[PDB]
Amino acid sequence: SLFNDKVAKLLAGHEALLMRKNEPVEEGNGVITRYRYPVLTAAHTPVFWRYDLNEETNPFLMERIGMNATLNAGAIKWDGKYLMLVRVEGADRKSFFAVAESPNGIDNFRFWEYPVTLPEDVVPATNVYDMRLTAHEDGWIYGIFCAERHDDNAPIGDLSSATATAGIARTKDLKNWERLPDLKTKSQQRNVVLHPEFVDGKYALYTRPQDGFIDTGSGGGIGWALIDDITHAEVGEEKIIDKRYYHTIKEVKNGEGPHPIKTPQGWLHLAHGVRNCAAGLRYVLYMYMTSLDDPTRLIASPAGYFMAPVGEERIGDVSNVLFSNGWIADDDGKVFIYYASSDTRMHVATSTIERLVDYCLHTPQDGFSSSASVEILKNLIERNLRLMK
Amino acid sequence: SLFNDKVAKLLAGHEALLMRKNEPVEEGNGVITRYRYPVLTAAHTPVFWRYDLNEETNPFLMERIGMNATLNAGAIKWDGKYLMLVRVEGADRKSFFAVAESPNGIDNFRFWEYPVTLPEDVVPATNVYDMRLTAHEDGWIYGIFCAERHDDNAPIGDLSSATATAGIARTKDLKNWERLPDLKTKSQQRNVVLHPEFVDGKYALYTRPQDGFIDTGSGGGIGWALIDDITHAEVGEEKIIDKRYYHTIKEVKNGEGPHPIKTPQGWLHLAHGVRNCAAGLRYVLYMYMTSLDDPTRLIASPAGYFMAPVGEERIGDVSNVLFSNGWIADDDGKVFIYYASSDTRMHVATSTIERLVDYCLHTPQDGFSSSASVEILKNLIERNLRLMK
Amino acid sequence: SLFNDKVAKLLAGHEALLMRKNEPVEEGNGVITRYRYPVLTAAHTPVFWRYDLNEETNPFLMERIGMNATLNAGAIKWDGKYLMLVRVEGADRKSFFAVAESPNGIDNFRFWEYPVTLPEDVVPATNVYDMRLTAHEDGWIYGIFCAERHDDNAPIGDLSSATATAGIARTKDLKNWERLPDLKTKSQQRNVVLHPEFVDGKYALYTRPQDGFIDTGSGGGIGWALIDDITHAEVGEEKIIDKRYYHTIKEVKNGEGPHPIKTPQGWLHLAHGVRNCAAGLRYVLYMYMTSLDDPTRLIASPAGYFMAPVGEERIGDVSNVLFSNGWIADDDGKVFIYYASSDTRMHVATSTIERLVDYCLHTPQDGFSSSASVEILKNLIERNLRLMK
Amino acid sequence: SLFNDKVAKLLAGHEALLMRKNEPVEEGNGVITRYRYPVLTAAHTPVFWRYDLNEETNPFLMERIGMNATLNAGAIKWDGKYLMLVRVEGADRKSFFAVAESPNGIDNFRFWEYPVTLPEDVVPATNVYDMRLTAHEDGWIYGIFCAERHDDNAPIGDLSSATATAGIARTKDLKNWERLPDLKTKSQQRNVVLHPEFVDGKYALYTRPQDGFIDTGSGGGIGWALIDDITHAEVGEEKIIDKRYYHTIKEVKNGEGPHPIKTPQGWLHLAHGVRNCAAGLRYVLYMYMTSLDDPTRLIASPAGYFMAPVGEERIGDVSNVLFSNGWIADDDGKVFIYYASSDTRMHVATSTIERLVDYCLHTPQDGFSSSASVEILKNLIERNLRLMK
Ligand SMILES: OC[C@H]1O[C@@H](O)[C@@H](O)[C@@H](O)[C@@H]1O
Ligand SMILES: OC[C@H]1O[C@@H](O)[C@@H](O)[C@@H](O)[C@@H]1O
Ligand SMILES: OC[C@H]1O[C@@H](O)[C@@H](O)[C@@H](O)[C@@H]1O
Ligand SMILES: OC[C@H]1O[C@@H](O)[C@@H](O)[C@@H](O)[C@@H]1O
Ligand SMILES: OC[C@H]1O[C@@H](O)[C@H](O)[C@@H](O)[C@@H]1O
Ligand SMILES: OC[C@H]1O[C@@H](O)[C@H](O)[C@@H](O)[C@@H]1O
Ligand SMILES: OC[C@H]1O[C@@H](O)[C@H](O)[C@@H](O)[C@@H]1O
Ligand SMILES: OC[C@H]1O[C@@H](O)[C@H](O)[C@@H](O)[C@@H]1O
């Protein structure tokens, strides 16, 4: 029948998309390798999420539930597989979480047949997004995410005013999730992330205090807060670890991405930085390192951005954005960086622990001015010209 | 496992290839419409024909039986479906027959899981090829094909001299085939085709007498022979119906393609014509019509070729060749022409009975010289310029 | 109406094709510059040559007269315009001549609305082809071409054996052509070309004696023959000017292309050379020069080919062929070379008289062996490495 | 200056071409992996082979010595590098030998600055081609090649009749070559190849007896001949090891490619097979194995071709041809197969010894008929369908 043939073709096209082999992009900077294809797009969502496959109830075979975007994904190595904890945004503009797995980390990602069922905390949330997974030493996998609600305290007609809180959930199988109380804090929070080890016997959070829903205001950067009880999480003291700076890629806002990777040289961090331009907000990725002895102490601040939008990455629902809240480091040192472009699709970039540490340690620090940048550059040129002669 | 993933990808890629929607080529001549993709290539043969899918016996997952070409296919409308009787040539250089079926005639052709099992006649054949299917009024589907054997008259070292006979088989299901005796005749034959109706109460064959295996010699063109008994087929009287002519597209050789289509205006024929050039033999398609009252009598001879190699068609194992031995005319008058290019792949072109008859009746006849061609052309130009003013 | 819209689209698409700007190919050898697009293809023939545009007599709007190829064109600068004398081959396999003109020499060639009407000589010809135009000092434009007829000596069934004579016609407007008697000669001739000046007060022809229709046999190369009376042309004395040589690009056959260009350094010639290979005959272009004092005396023989098939040129009705019988040299020294590829389409390449003479004079002569080729090459390498150090 | 800029651009473009990274073709058959780009083309020859770079003597900066093709290359692993012994054909139609080297075997091949200087034997040769390199246990690198001369028996006008002898040269550095006497034998020979080990204390050659220059006539296949003294080489006893067969890919001609690779399972051979078709001669590659105990004894004959022209490979000066006379097997079992397409360019395909042996041992043998091919195929289908259920 024509209908059954159409269903068969939908499924066949979907399998071909899912199984497509990724290929590295040859041209790169020696730090990271980009890949030709995204690891996930809205088109990667299962056919059976979007279409009613029953001819009786969907004789035209049209989509019943449109899928808009697959973005800002957490990540974890799980039972030998490479997992993303994907933020999937429907055509209805709500996001939900969904696990996708790959045998190799760069292609053949496939969504688990059901997305994540996440219980509400005591106050219901309208949207949930951007989960960071932490396999904590306490034996749980934590997902720290943004729980967003309308702010009724707004002028009449204002349906955009919102509040962001840090949601906390944990699981041991990524299917059954326990929702803990939202983080209690004196400011709005987004980009909260759980450090994987106890520090002074306490849970440690990366935080990002902000005066408003979109603007940080007095919020000084990426914060650090020790928490006595993750099941009744409340910030007491909050210390800024990585600061915003005028005329850097992290001027207006910044935030921790995934939880950092432990290296012999220190904690290796991946974050985003924001500045304003004539086209709106521009988001890039950057890195920093902190001490093993004192994870609050910066020990490497390579100047500028680590990755910024290239090519197809530049365009999407929210253009001029890269964002990451997930990466995986294998035992052999290979690193898989899962980053979204333009709030629309997920990509992978690969590197190694040794290369990322080399990048952090030997990319000169920002001296904060054009004159300083020129002096750093002239010094390198002088070395190279001597060598090339 | 890596092996199972590899098998799953082979199957998935194959399904995507098989299900690809064909699209008509916009640029055309108003007679036939070409399509963007071939209907069959060697890559269309089933994965399970080529690969041993068992890891125990094929751990590297390599092809065990290479497929080289899918060409010169017969065709029949069968139980609501569009069928080709494909000549499939293996990497071993032997050909065999195999049914492929489509729901619509222009794409989604898929081979039946097993190819054709064709019993030998009394004298075994080395190769069999180019089967024309005829649904005869006697209730059988006949396949008339070429059965080729090494020429025993050949001297030491000559492993190329061959003989061609017309093989005859029949079936009622395209799975169980009865092999009848090879056609008895005084010359070599290839391109023998069964006319679908009795004529004077006898079976009627299109023939192509030839003095040698490749060259026709004294062979004058496409012949017509009435046969009393198809189960003991022997040519007696033989008349040339469509002749070779110097400096036409059918100078050196010609041959009937599929059996002709019955129209109210006469029998509509599709044939091939051959000439020599610096690059070897060049094969094109051409049409002609014969009378319903007397199928041996020509009533339309449009000048020149009907189709010749265009673009991708020009290149293959045997370049500069189009060949057809199959077409299907639906009750609504739509015609699906199945033609091979360069002995390598199968294509489809579509037309209608009305357009093909129009083409045959109103394409001026060849006057056989440059001066005559110019006079025909000047006449048309004069009419058009008068109209365009 | 749908019909009128269809006609309007045919005309519009044709105009867009005709007006397309050509672009030079950047990669070249410094001798000639190729161009991205052919100057003519079969699709360039007028819409009103191919279609009957009257809905009453062609309601399906299909082509009534197919055009197959535009090839082997003569060329002349004429009343400020760049003209080709095109060999146009119909789908009927007959060729006829047709003028096409361009304002600039590299694109926007358009056929004159009517093709050439060429009267027959006393014995009618089946095909005419490959006309070389010569603006002779006697005030006439001569076209010397091949007039082909079926060989009456041929046995039953032989519809391929043919004879080639040199046809001679002249005109003062390229519209009204006077057919003079075919050249009288003791062998078959093709590639006969009129030298533009009297020599010893006589007409001078380039000739190409050949024992057969396709193969030259004892024919030694490109010949030279003085003719008292072009209106009763008969060869008496005949001298070979440029010879075939074993293991060169002109081993099996050769022939003069267009008439040579007069330069201060001598007559600049363009010719074709043929050898056999596993795929058939391979045709390339080559150049040579002869003395102004004695046009029968070679003064430059650059080794090897001048042009050979590249890319798209390699494929067509008769693949692996370049052929030229037309070029134009402007007063400023710019040269437009019109060459066919694969008997299918017409191309242009540009150079200058200075560059072509440079090429002829300073491309080393063929020493006729691998050892000699290596010695020439090692000498150049040695010079370059010395320079590059 | 404009001239110096032009030279700098020629050199820069050439370096970019030479350094281009090759990429494997994903679609394959599991036996061999093809690559996206040729390893060598005529454009890969050095700029300083083709252009005179001195403005004084070449002010137009045009090529002085055209290069036409890089084909049929021998191969050897040499001092840690991957070397081809390239047949380079000039625009003058003569070939010469030239070493090209790569660090990795699949790209970045670069010609040595000077080509090979090969001394003549007592009788000079017009062309030399298709050298097979053998690192013999006697400590020398031998190159066995074809030395071609015009046939003196030829009649007037015949500049094509030629004779082929087996040329023998040796070297210890690929720069200084000693020319030994041409092989003495009772028939013409081409595709002669030196086996790398003594057999019965004697040199062993693969041979290919042929009655004519192009056609083998009574020549039965690939031969084997023991030679006492390679410096006065003469064939005595000669045995056919791999035979031509009607209706196989090696019907008309065959010949050994490179010398075979030693494996624990036997000698692994790569050869070419030829048949005739309407377009001329068609050349494909095939494999076979012989015994370690007795290298004259066949132990594996996989049916059909190993590789045949695909895509771009199908077209060139001599289309419809693959040819190999070189491959390299690394100690780790990786195999680099260097094969020419269409006598025009050089390609690489990769495999492993294990895969190639698997292919030879488990691709079913040719049963020599359509019925046999169908039975082999039906058996595999039956196994697969049983597995797939
Ligand atoms: O950002 C868009 C433009 O912004 C303006 O301020 C200009 O000064 C430019 O520096 C810049 O191109
Ligand atoms: O090879 C070109 C053509 O040759 C003829 O003999 C036909 O029988 C076809 O089988 C083939 O397409
Ligand atoms: O077919 C290749 C060539 O053959 C020769 O005979 C020429 O006369 C040309 O007409 C043609 O281009
Ligand atoms: O031309 C096709 C092939 O012809 C054969 O003679 C071989 O010797 C090769 O030199 C060539 O590749
Ligand atoms: O910019 C703040 C937030 O605004 C919301 O509307 C979007 O859904 C988020 O993805 C975004 O992070
Ligand atoms: O040309 C005659 C025949 O020759 C055979 O070798 C080919 O297999 C056929 O396809 C072809 O029709
Ligand atoms: O090869 C000789 C001639 O043969 C004819 O059949 C072709 O029409 C000519 O174009 C060709 O030049
Ligand atoms: O076909 C036989 C030989 O003919 C020669 O003219 C070619 O140069 C060779 O490459 C070829 O192998």
PDB file of N, CA, C and O in Angstrom, chain A residues 269-285:
ATOM      1  N   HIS A 269      38.797  23.155  32.850  1.00  0.00           N
ATOM      2  CA  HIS A 269      37.430  23.673  32.724  1.00  0.00           C
ATOM      3  C   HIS A 269      37.069  24.128  31.315  1.00  0.00           C
ATOM      4  O   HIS A 269      37.894  24.689  30.587  1.00  0.00           O
ATOM      5  N   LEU A 270      35.798  23.952  30.984  1.00  0.00           N
ATOM      6  CA  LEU A 270      35.222  24.468  29.757  1.00  0.00           C
ATOM      7  C   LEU A 270      34.009  25.308  30.143  1.00  0.00           C
ATOM      8  O   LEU A 270      33.145  24.856  30.905  1.00  0.00           O
ATOM      9  N   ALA A 271      33.973  26.538  29.634  1.00  0.00           N
ATOM     10  CA  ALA A 271      32.953  27.523  29.997  1.00  0.00           C
ATOM     11  C   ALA A 271      32.476  28.291  28.763  1.00  0.00           C
ATOM     12  O   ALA A 271      33.076  28.192  27.691  1.00  0.00           O
ATOM     13  N   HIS A 272      31.401  29.058  28.917  1.00  0.00           N
ATOM     14  CA  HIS A 272      31.024  29.999  27.877  1.00  0.00           C
ATOM     15  C   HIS A 272      31.187  31.434  28.332  1.00  0.00           C
ATOM     16  O   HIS A 272      31.063  31.737  29.526  1.00  0.00           O
ATOM     17  N   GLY A 273      31.469  32.303  27.368  1.00  0.00           N
ATOM     18  CA  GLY A 273      31.603  33.720  27.610  1.00  0.00           C
ATOM     19  C   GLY A 273      30.724  34.495  26.653  1.00  0.00           C
ATOM     20  O   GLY A 273      30.563  34.100  25.497  1.00  0.00           O
ATOM     21  N   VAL A 274      30.159  35.598  27.129  1.00  0.00           N
ATOM     22  CA  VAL A 274      29.219  36.382  26.338  1.00  0.00           C
ATOM     23  C   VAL A 274      29.650  37.839  26.268  1.00  0.00           C
ATOM     24  O   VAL A 274      30.145  38.399  27.253  1.00  0.00           O
ATOM     25  N   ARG A 275      29.453  38.450  25.098  1.00  0.00           N
ATOM     26  CA  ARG A 275      29.556  39.897  24.963  1.00  0.00           C
ATOM     27  C   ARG A 275      28.400  40.390  24.112  1.00  0.00           C
ATOM     28  O   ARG A 275      27.749  39.602  23.427  1.00  0.00           O
ATOM     29  N   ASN A 276      28.134  41.688  24.169  1.00  0.00           N
ATOM     30  CA  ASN A 276      27.106  42.292  23.341  1.00  0.00           C
ATOM     31  C   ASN A 276      27.705  42.843  22.044  1.00  0.00           C
ATOM     32  O   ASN A 276      28.844  43.314  22.022  1.00  0.00           O
ATOM     33  N   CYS A 277      26.938  42.763  20.962  1.00  0.00           N
ATOM     34  CA  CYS A 277      27.328  43.374  19.701  1.00  0.00           C
ATOM     35  C   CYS A 277      26.072  43.871  19.009  1.00  0.00           C
ATOM     36  O   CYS A 277      24.972  43.727  19.543  1.00  0.00           O
ATOM     37  N   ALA A 278      26.230  44.464  17.829  1.00  0.00           N
ATOM     38  CA  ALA A 278      25.090  45.059  17.137  1.00  0.00           C
ATOM     39  C   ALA A 278      24.020  44.038  16.772  1.00  0.00           C
ATOM     40  O   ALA A 278      22.873  44.416  16.528  1.00  0.00           O
ATOM     41  N   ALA A 279      24.396  42.758  16.727  1.00  0.00           N
ATOM     42  CA  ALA A 279      23.471  41.685  16.365  1.00  0.00           C
ATOM     43  C   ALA A 279      22.854  40.998  17.571  1.00  0.00           C
ATOM     44  O   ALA A 279      22.052  40.072  17.406  1.00  0.00           O
ATOM     45  N   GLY A 280      23.234  41.425  18.775  1.00  0.00           N
ATOM     46  CA  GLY A 280      22.722  40.803  19.984  1.00  0.00           C
ATOM     47  C   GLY A 280      23.852  40.218  20.812  1.00  0.00           C
ATOM     48  O   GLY A 280      24.981  40.726  20.785  1.00  0.00           O
ATOM     49  N   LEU A 281      23.553  39.150  21.549  1.00  0.00           N
ATOM     50  CA  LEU A 281      24.565  38.515  22.393  1.00  0.00           C
ATOM     51  C   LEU A 281      25.379  37.508  21.592  1.00  0.00           C
ATOM     52  O   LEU A 281      24.832  36.748  20.786  1.00  0.00           O
ATOM     53  N   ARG A 282      26.687  37.503  21.811  1.00  0.00           N
ATOM     54  CA  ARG A 282      27.565  36.573  21.115  1.00  0.00           C
ATOM     55  C   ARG A 282      28.220  35.649  22.135  1.00  0.00           C
ATOM     56  O   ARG A 282      28.852  36.116  23.095  1.00  0.00           O
ATOM     57  N   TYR A 283      28.037  34.347  21.942  1.00  0.00           N
ATOM     58  CA  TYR A 283      28.520  33.338  22.883  1.00  0.00           C
ATOM     59  C   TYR A 283      29.648  32.528  22.268  1.00  0.00           C
ATOM     60  O   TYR A 283      29.495  31.979  21.170  1.00  0.00           O
ATOM     61  N   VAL A 284      30.764  32.424  22.988  1.00  0.00           N
ATOM     62  CA  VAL A 284      31.871  31.572  22.591  1.00  0.00           C
ATOM     63  C   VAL A 284      32.292  30.687  23.757  1.00  0.00           C
ATOM     64  O   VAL A 284      31.874  30.893  24.903  1.00  0.00           O
ATOM     65  N   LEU A 285      33.117  29.690  23.464  1.00  0.00           N
ATOM     66  CA  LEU A 285      33.634  28.822  24.518  1.00  0.00           C
ATOM     67  C   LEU A 285      35.036  29.237  24.921  1.00  0.00           C
ATOM     68  O   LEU A 285      35.822  29.691  24.090  1.00  0.00           O
TER      69      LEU A 285
END
